[PDB]
Amino acid sequence: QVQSGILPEHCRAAIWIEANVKGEVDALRAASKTFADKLATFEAKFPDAHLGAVVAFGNNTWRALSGGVGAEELKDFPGYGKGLAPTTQFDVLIHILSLRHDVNFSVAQAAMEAFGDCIEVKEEIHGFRWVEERDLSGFVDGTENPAGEETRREVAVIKDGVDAGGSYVFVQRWEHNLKQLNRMSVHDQEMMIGRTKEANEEIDGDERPETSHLTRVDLKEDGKGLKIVRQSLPYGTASGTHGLYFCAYCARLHNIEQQLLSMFGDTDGKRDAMLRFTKPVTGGYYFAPSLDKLMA
Amino acid sequence: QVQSGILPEHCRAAIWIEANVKGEVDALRAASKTFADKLATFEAKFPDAHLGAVVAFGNNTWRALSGGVGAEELKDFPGYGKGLAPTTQFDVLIHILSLRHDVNFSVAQAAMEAFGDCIEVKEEIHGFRWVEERDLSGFVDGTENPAGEETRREVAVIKDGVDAGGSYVFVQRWEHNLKQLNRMSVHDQEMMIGRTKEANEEIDGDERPETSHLTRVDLKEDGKGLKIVRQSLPYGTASGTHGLYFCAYCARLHNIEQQLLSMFGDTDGKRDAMLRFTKPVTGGYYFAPSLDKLMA
Numbered sequence A, B: 001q002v003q004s005g006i007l008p009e010h011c012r013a014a015i016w017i018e019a020n021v022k023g024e025v026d027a028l029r030a031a032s033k034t035f036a037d038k039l040a041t042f043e044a045k046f047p048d049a050h051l052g053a054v055v056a057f058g059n060n061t062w063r064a065l066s067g068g069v070g071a072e073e074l075k076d077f078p079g080y081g082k083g084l085a086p087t088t089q090f091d092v093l094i095h096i097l098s099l100r101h102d103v104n105f106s107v108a109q110a111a112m113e114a115f116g117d118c119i120e121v122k123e124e125i126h127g128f129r130w131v132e133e134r135d136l137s138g139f140v141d142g143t144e145n146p147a148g149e150e151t152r153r154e155v156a157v158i159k160d161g162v163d164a165g166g167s168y169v170f171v172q173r174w175e176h177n178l179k180q181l182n183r184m185s186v187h188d189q190e191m192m193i194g195r196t197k198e199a200n201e202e203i204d205g206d207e208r209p210e211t212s213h214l215t216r217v218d219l220k221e222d223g224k225g226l227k228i229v230r231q232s233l234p235y236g237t238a239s240g241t242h243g244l245y246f247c248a249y250c251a252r253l254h255n256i257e258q259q260l261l262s263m264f265g266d267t268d269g270k271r272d273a274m275l276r277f278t279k280p281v282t283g284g285y286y287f288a289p290s291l292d293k294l295m296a
């Protein structure tokens, strides 16, 4: 039911392909089935790679494909924080993840043979897990991510309805200014995130500024926290552009919206303290149908 | 003696940084020691990663540093064929390789901290071994590469003299047109390379055109083969620029030159059949000193 790329944990490398439709939207129908078929035999060929992939679609493109059944919450990625979080909403998102760069590249090439004549690629980002699974800033990223199979399922996978087995996807590429980050003392960095750096222990939410990243994103509704499955990975070049490619899956887009509203100032006027050294430069929302509904 | 990045076999990832000198050349001296020191501590923290690196210098840059003793064959890359092989000779080449992307990136960031104020990066290329050690063309790459330690020393590391422990380096980034390649039938591609594609069997030098790649580069002097130690890896993006980052070390730049003369029409009038689908777009010669003469 669920596409294979949502639930796996601890991937070491990933490819994200963002693209707009080229020509008639209807060509995505056969391209998606061809890629899913190739994807399947790839996964049985390389079991030790823990390969997964998900194909997701933007609002206008999915409405034409659905159509326009389900995916109520899906909409074009708006702004947040008055341009602080820009919008670069595209039509198709392909996320490939596994333990191996070489397998990911064969799958991304298979995707490009399937979708080549009906998409125009806008960015292809190669993520990699860094040493000790730390963000390039030096902080461990992903500790409080849900785990494992059953919990991640209830957070990310739609349980019933037309969109059962589906999921909502948010992708946002950040560009780190590590020079600006290494201005701050390690203590100042820890107040910015909410956890100590080398030790990755959560700082109490009263000895920690309200602008801290954890205070921004640790949100509760009806006494229950709004959870997401994060598949983010560092990306880029040492001498050039680098940062975090943020990727989140959730059964409801609402959880992701609430955290963006908090982080970028549209909830209580306060902004995430990480904006002192890094900035998002892309942003889009996508609905990932079930592997079944992908008509493959 | 020898720098750690020349001899190791079976690396899974590599980073190449080509750059020009930014400011005065003398700043390279303390930078090279600072990086090579950090290099050794990285090798100690990751002893199982087969980590190595080499810092090499262009003609003018090395002549100043040398200066100008040794590196008799060192010179600016010409290059070849009235633009058939372009030349982009820079001053500094940093090559990092190991079994791990995450380790290589940390080493690359350490190099940018040591060299960041005396170099201007022109390109940073991230190489990865592809499935079955094949080139993105689908042909296995590396088969007749010298192996292992003893033979690779004989080929790549200078034995006697003031340059003992050093090596000559050629880097050349190619861009594959895989649409134009998958034009051709398998038999056509095999006649282009000189080896069978699936089984990687060498086709006999009698059943293959003189323009075949193997015929171009399998050369002999005094009845003895002109060997090189290649460290080339695929690079790039599925939907955009991709191909082979070519990289070779040799005790004599003369072995690399003759193969270049042959491939690009200066020896037979004939040129390498691989130009039917791939093209070089960068090119530089560098001299990698011994680790000790690197003042480090």
Ligand code: HEM
Residues within 6 Å of the ligand: A135, A137, A139, A140, A141, A142, A143, A144, A145, A172, A174, A193, A195, A213, A214, A217, A218, A228, A244, A246, A248, A256, A259, A260, A263, A274, A278
């Ligand atoms: C440059 C961009 C970002 C960086 C460097 C970053 C870094 C971090 C770090 C270091 C942690 C603590 C380790 C962990 O538990 O995962 C964390 C946690 C978290 N992040 Fe991010 N983050 C970024 C963007 C975002 C965005 C845009 C969102 C949401 C839209 C988000 C959602 C979360 C959540 C929900 C947690 C877990 C909070 C908890 O329940 O403890 N992050 N992030």
Ligand code: HEM
Residues within 6 Å of the ligand: B135, B137, B139, B140, B141, B142, B143, B144, B145, B172, B174, B193, B195, B213, B214, B217, B218, B228, B244, B246, B248, B256, B259, B260, B263, B274, B278
């Ligand atoms: C896009 C460019 C290139 C591609 C795709 C490519 C690919 C290959 C392949 C598939 C082989 C046969 C497998 C092997 O034994 O390694 C090979 C062999 C070889 N290549 Fe390349 N190559 C390229 C450029 C070059 C260049 C520029 C040089 C020299 C400057 C070179 C030197 C060699 C040598 C010396 C061999 C060993 C041949 C033998 O002794 O049997 N290659 N290459």
